[PDB]
Design a protein around this nucleic acid. Sequence first.
RNA 1: CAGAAGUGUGCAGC
RNA 2: CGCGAAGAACCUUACCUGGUCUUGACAUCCACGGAAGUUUUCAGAGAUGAGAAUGUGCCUUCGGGAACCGUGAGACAGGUGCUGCAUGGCUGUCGUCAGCUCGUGUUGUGAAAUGUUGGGUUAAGUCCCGCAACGAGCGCAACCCUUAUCCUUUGUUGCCAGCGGUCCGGCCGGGAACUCAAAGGAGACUGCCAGUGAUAAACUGGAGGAAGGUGGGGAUGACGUCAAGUCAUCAUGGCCCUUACGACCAGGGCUACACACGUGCUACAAUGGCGCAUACAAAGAGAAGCGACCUCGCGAGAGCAAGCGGACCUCAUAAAGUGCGUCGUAGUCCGGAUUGGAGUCUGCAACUCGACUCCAUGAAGUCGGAAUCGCUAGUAAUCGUGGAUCAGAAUGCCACGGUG
Lengths: 101, 206, 99, 151, 83, 127
Amino acid sequence: AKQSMKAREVKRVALADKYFAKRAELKAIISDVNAASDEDRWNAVLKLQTLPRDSSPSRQRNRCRQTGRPHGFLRKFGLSRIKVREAAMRGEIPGLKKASW
Amino acid sequence: GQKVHPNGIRLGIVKPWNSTWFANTKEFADNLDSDFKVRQYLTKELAKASVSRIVIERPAKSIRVTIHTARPGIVIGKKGEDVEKLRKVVADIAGVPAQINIAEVRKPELDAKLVADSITSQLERRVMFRRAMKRAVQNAMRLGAKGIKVEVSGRLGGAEIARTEWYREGRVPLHTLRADIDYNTSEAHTTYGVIGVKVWIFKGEI
Amino acid sequence: QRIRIRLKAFDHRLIDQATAEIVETAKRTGAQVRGPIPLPTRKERFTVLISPHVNKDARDQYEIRTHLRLVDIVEPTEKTVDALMRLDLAAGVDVQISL
Amino acid sequence: PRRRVIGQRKILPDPKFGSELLAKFVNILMVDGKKSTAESIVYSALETLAQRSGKSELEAFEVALENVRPTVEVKSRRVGGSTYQVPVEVRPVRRNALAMRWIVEAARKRGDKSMALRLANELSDAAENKGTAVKKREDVHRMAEANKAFA
Amino acid sequence: PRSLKKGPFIDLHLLKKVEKAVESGDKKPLRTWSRRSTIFPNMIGLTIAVHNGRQHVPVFVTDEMVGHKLGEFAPTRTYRGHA
Amino acid sequence: NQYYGTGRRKSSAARVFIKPGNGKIVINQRSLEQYFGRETARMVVRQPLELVDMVEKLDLYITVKGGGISGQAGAIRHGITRALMEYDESLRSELRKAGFVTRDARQVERKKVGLRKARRRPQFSKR
RNA sequence: CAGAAGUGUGCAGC
RNA sequence: CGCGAAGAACCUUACCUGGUCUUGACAUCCACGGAAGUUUUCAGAGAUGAGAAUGUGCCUUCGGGAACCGUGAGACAGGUGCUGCAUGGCUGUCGUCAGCUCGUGUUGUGAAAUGUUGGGUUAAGUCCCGCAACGAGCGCAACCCUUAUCCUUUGUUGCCAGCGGUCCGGCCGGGAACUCAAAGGAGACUGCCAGUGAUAAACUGGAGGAAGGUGGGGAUGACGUCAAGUCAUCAUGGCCCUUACGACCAGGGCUACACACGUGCUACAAUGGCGCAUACAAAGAGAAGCGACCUCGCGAGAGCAAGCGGACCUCAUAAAGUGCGUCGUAGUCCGGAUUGGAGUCUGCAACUCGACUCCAUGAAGUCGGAAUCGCUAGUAAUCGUGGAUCAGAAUGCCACGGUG
Ligand SMILES: [K+]
Ligand SMILES: [K+]
Ligand SMILES: [K+]
Ligand SMILES: [K+]
Ligand SMILES: [K+]
Ligand SMILES: [Mg+2]
Ligand SMILES: [Mg+2]
Ligand SMILES: [Mg+2]
Ligand SMILES: [Mg+2]
Ligand SMILES: [Mg+2]
Ligand SMILES: [Mg+2]
Ligand SMILES: [Mg+2]
Ligand SMILES: [Mg+2]
Ligand SMILES: [Mg+2]
Ligand SMILES: [Mg+2]
Ligand SMILES: [Mg+2]
Ligand SMILES: [Mg+2]
Ligand SMILES: [Mg+2]
Ligand SMILES: [Mg+2]
Ligand SMILES: [Mg+2]
Ligand SMILES: [Mg+2]
Ligand SMILES: [Mg+2]
Ligand SMILES: [Mg+2]
Ligand SMILES: [Mg+2]
């Protein structure tokens, strides 16, 4: 994948940890709150929009680690269907082998 | 048509895995990534030390790497001064503390990886591919392989149209699962582009 | 109280010899042991398209089998629990322990 | 098939009347594997046919089937430049299969308010030597005798 | 539609401009790209130039428009018959 | 003492204990007629004892698990036949003729990649 | 018994 | 042609409009000044600009060096730009078809032939006889996984035959019997018996057995053909750009709509629809997770909160079915598209452009022209269940079991 895409993805992944991982309280505790005054909820709703947009985890693409391919990713291995098989048949994956039943 | 990769089909039947560790899904991908990084580093580092194989094992929240090479003294370094550098940089890459072990490949002529790399190097030296192939086959047979075949593919001799050329001696039963077929592939980056070399070596059944 | 050990591995022979070592060392150390129970072999199946482009019907199917073994030390005297804490195993085995 | 010849698969006789022939009839009326639905339909039709006829269920079914089983069928026979319809003496097992298929497919397309009643009516007509299953048998025989010149 | 628990959504960078536009009296059309912002009552009588992808389209906020999203008044695709 | 048979069919497995007694049948603590609503099952569970002609001389306690109606019915018939061959081995030659001793091996065929089903191929078109 | 047609032009394997 | 894509609201994204940068978003080297970083304001759609408020690791063998930051000059980065007819790797297909070759010998001036053909036989260039051929290799078969029977061993989180208790709940003491879990072993071999056959190889029938003649299913794809597919997974020769074909940002598009074709889903009904009760599965997933009980809501869901890295807890009351009532051949109590209204949830955000719930509305359709497709048994047909991708978002794909 185009090198810019890799830089962009790692930038997003880093930036997400600087905010929402900590300031998730702003949404989950307040903007979602029912037990608390609607003025505070409104202020929190408006405040959340001020965080840098790329800090939302919903914007991470989750690319293949070895080639950055977006499609065909497998979450168990971190690899695309291509690189996973290349490693598999070369025996680099510690328990994977062809199945039959 | 296509053929199954002859090593992968034999895993657990007669061929062991090159990685051996247990992990839960949480750390599985990170183990696989750091293993890939260390393998890539060691391959780039030892490119002239005839490293055949790298085995990675992750005991007791530690990594230890076994390197199989046909040229051990070069990898070890005088007084062992080189394995210190390798183990430190491996500990840096993996983060966990690292141990490195080295093992002799006694007869590199019976190793498909070292034969493939030899042919590749000779091709990049602009050797005639026919001679490289013939030399490889003859040496393997005289040293006691039960069989061998070799293949070279693409723009051979700078020809304008690609060819595949292959040569076979002895017995090479790829469909026999009991057969310990060693196999490997390498690529020569000539001025004309990539030439692909494949090697199969048969050492007997079971 | 009992202590309970769960072994997980990708090789039934490796897990076998691990359990054999556990049982032999324990009984040599005077432990009472309730013997290795094979728990069900959790297995993962994957399917991948093997062509770099198109060919949706060209696929390979792979599996990973996780073998499990359960063993109970029913009278874990001090020397037995100490020895069982001292053992080391091949990296292919995960050992998880409980009291 | 061209290599093989196949031995018949084991059938189980009908649980209420003990007939493999009624079992085949059920298996033909069955749809989507709903065996028990077909069984219920067949039993209702047979009991109503029985009370109409003053006969046992299997007796009425047998006398109905007698009226529709064909004796001959027409088969396409090739010749080096032509094809002819030729009459062939159909064997008894195929006779039963044909008769049951014709009864079922005739009943299926009736308008009556339920399949059990459609079936009972069609079996009555067949026993009465009338209706669509019988006209099917009839025109098969007509075609056979019209082609008899090539037999 | 947005969950009734949360109340309607407006972009801060638009609201800050609606404010001073109400103070000024819609002296000039307010350009915006916040097609997603909801039309609040305070906006009635303003003109907002909503982006459509290549142009800003003047929308005059009629009282009937309250509670819709601005983008509903700025079509993004052009069609005018096949032949 | 109990005479025993395990039997199975498809995914269903049954344990059958038989003993001398006045013809009682119980399945999972339910009557035969209560457990099975379909006459085919009610027939096949009897078939072996009907042919042996002991329906009024033996009683049996059964448990059955897995599979659906017919799977469990066949599993019970198989367990019954094994248990009663243990009771009287001389009946085996008869039960062989009856066909009950054969453990019916027709398991479900697994789905295969590229096919909608076990064998149903997608619709093909020339163009 | 019936069933016609298939544009031009190239290159490796010594 | 439900194809790459195992999942396009932003991202993804490679496209368009506009706004921005130029040794660069990504890498190494070199010189200069600074730890890194934290909290906060004003502008702007945001990129980016400005400005404030805060903060010193480790020897310093004191010269700085170790990270990171900014700055500055060149080598250079970068390119999802073109060539799959320059390539590697990988893949489709004839085709899981039974074929394809070589050494030595011999025959022919030679290209070549023989072997590999002939008589039987097999799923098979499988095997046996004959024969200027004698041998061998890649294929077939077997080794491998799974399923159908048994036996040994262990026996909790799984099981409950036989015993005491019981609140009727394997829930209790208890048993290791049984199911099951899963390590090891046994069994199938034309092994045995008639008949046919060329004293052959093998065919017909029979016994025993859970299984009989490749027992069922999978993996396994020979030499090569299609200059078949991919320079957009990746690698790579050549070519082209380098104040732009490179890089950042917001909005839009990939979701258009006169139409034509492919693959599917739901139907046209009584072998059915609706309503009430009640039976019988397998296989999977779970920590940025699966989420019980209880309370609230017609419902989607909300609150509280147990348990579970799991044979234990959750996902999760399978549906077809069986019993009873009702509808009465109707464009209907069939069908549920379209459209108005009110909501839930995920998310910075559901206008373009999400899913689902409630109320209302209730199209076309009454078995489909020429033509055409799949399937040989636990198959077709039919009925439910799970998983990957995944914040949310399957009628597709990959698996499972029921009836049959
Ligand atoms: K290629
Ligand atoms: K020759
Ligand atoms: K290129
Ligand atoms: K569909
Ligand atoms: K999902
Ligand atoms: Mg996403
Ligand atoms: Mg097609
Ligand atoms: Mg002409
Ligand atoms: Mg021509
Ligand atoms: Mg498809
Ligand atoms: Mg976009
Ligand atoms: Mg193309
Ligand atoms: Mg040939
Ligand atoms: Mg022959
Ligand atoms: Mg052969
Ligand atoms: Mg011969
Ligand atoms: Mg084979
Ligand atoms: Mg082409
Ligand atoms: Mg392209
Ligand atoms: Mg954009
Ligand atoms: Mg599209
Ligand atoms: Mg009608
Ligand atoms: Mg077939
Ligand atoms: Mg099924």
